[PDB]
Swiss-Prot record, chains A, B, C, D:
One of its GO terms (molecular function) is pyroglutamyl-peptidase activity. Removes 5-oxoproline from various penultimate amino acid residues except L-proline. InterPro entries: Peptidase_C15 (IPR000816), Peptidase_C15-like (IPR016125), Peptidase_C15-like_sf (IPR036440), PGP-I_bact-type (IPR029762), PGPEP1_Cys_AS (IPR033694), PGPEP1_Glu_AS (IPR033693). Its EC number is 3.4.19.3. The active site is at E79, S142, H166. It is an enzyme of class 3 (hydrolase). It comes from Pyrococcus furiosus (strain ATCC 43587 / DSM 3638 / JCM 8422 / Vc1). The gene is pcp. Belongs to the peptidase C15 family. This is Pyrrolidone-carboxylate peptidase.
Length: 208, 208, 208, 208
């Protein structure tokens, strides 16, 4: 049993992206006899697809849990759906701002996450971790990778389960925001890491 | 050198108030040779004044740091001013909803906190703790105690420094909020506790 | 050329739903030689489908613009996608709270709105009307009708264009909210009405 | 009976300030036999004080209602208190960003508005105008003028009543905000103007 967890590099002017550390912290660990692989993806259209595809083909995980930062969100959010569209509010790390363009021409308009999202949310709550189901992962890189992963599952047969989890800013990222005229919500890195571990465990238990 | 830290009991239907635990956790500890006393106050007009007055007279602290819960706030907030007014949006724990009434008839319309609020905010930031200066502690029990404490200082000569710190909901308090149609910001109890300890240390260093 | 505009009846305890008036105000009007029909839909699962289906079959509009109230939103929002799922945060007007259930079993996971959403947004901006593209119409009745309308288009060939527009609370709906501990954003009814008229005109110009 | 209404010039990069038009629109009008004077103030520390002082001495109004723009607020807000402090989050129109400095050294820490704020709020509600009581007018120019006006009343005996009213962005100011990654609340200029007229009428009726 193999699990792939991905995170993203910093973007949008931020010095850090907490999901990058999550991926690195979880890489190489084992939950039961399941092997976990952690990989960081670039916040760049096209290149992110190349890396994701190569990683999926290399590892061939049974479960894929893609993690990303969601500025402004106040709790852990589990994405219910991936949409076949790109409409960036901001450009990617290479200055590309793609608007109204499909991710995969001719492919389904959307894919539902195949992770047991409701069970994951329930377990997180039991652990005192606020979490909810998000109905839009945006139309930037998070949705981009979420869709491609689910499409890979639908066309290649693996991973069996795929989904996306967004985390809020971590406290240290809020400091420079103060004075700039706003105080966005934040959540500790420790809670985020535990949340992802819980998601993996629940997904695994689901696959038996 | 003596420091008094207060917290509040649960109110507004909440099962817990994180500041109650903060007070209990800090009671009896020492920062350097300074003795810290932690006391919990009732969320009841009148009675809260009795308890506060008695506590202040009993301990005669050099520094008083009153802590409270601020539902909806996203980071640690240090109150800049206490206002001589009561206008409760909700009733206190005994069903009393006082509207447009002074706290102390004839006393000053307001008192500025005497804690080194800017230095405290700066130190918190250096510790990676998001914090900002609040210009209104509301007109409920937090402001009530903040004003009475500062008034005590002005009329009795002690405590030398007095102020108020509000903390966001802690994560576990958000669980039942989910589904109710909203996900308020939250901050870990551990961060809150450390923030209060930092405030105490900075206040002490200020008094020398 | 025929255009169908729908609105919803009051729900969630609200005395009014501004979209109900929008539908009635636009019913019978003409934009050029295009005939506009305005109909009000019940905020009830099942029944809403019956009414929508019957209305679509009766009128056979070339363009369908469904309007609804989005409590909390601050500006006009044009829905980009309809999702094949029902997961009500609150029950409908008949007390039914459907959770994790498809709208049409076996049908596509989602449909993109076929209204020229970007052009509509642009024209609204030129008119000084704040508007943006929403990537989730929720999973309540608004999404329910949006999906069914787009599904009707895909399977029956009409309407040629279908989409959904959400409007904020109108000012009068905020009054009772004040004191309840919150002041949600609002937008004038007049602006909402004009926004819908603009959307219709742009959609029509698109069909030529 | 004379009434002075003030507004502010554009600031913070905005092309307009709706309160500037409010002042000009109300200048010269009469409510009953009361004469209303409308004046625009610069968003500049020091200079704003000069203009305010000169205006107050020139007109010697019985009632002074200062109006300002509050970016982000969703409804009309009536300020309850003015604070003797300056701590600008942004610089004024001349690049001056004053931090932790009193407005009037030695003067009271704060002054309560002498306008019948609760009655004004009630009348606005009866007119279908969402409005609430604000407990902080910020520590920028709005608070600056509010405090100086109330201080003038306390030391000079006039105006008899003084207060501050903040209005949200008007819709047209939101357009350029869209895409920038946020849609702030807004309220029509017409509603703002009526709200100020209502405040004046209620204040006048209070003075008899």
């Amino acid at each position: 049993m193999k699990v792939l967890v991905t995170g993203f590099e910093p973007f949008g002017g931020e010095k850090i992206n907490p999901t990058e550390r999550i991926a690195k912290d979880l890489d190489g660990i084992k939950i039961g006899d399941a092997q976990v692989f952690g990989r960081v993806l670039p916040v760049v259209f096209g290149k992110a697809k190349e890396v994701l595809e190569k990683t999926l083909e290399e590892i061939k995980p049974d479960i894929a849990i893609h993690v990303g930062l969601a500025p402004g969100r106040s709790a852990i959010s589990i994405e219910r759906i991936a949409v076949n569209a790109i409409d960036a509010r901001i450009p990617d790390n290479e200055g590309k701002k793609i608007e109204d363009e499909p991710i995969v021409p001719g492919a389904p308009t959307a894919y539902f996450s195949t992770l047991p999202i409701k069970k994951i949310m329930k377990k997180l709550h039991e652990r005192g971790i606020p979490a909810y189901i998000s109905n839009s992962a945006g139309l930037y890189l998070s949705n981009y990778v979420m869709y491609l992963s689910l499409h890979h599952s639908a066309t290649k047969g693996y991973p069996k389960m795929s989904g996306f989890i967004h985390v809020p800013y971590i406290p240290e990222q809020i400091i420079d925001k103060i004075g700039k005229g706003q105080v966005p919500p934040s959540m500790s890195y420790e809670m985020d890491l535990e949340a992802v571990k819980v998601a993996i465990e629940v997904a695994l238990e689901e696959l038996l």
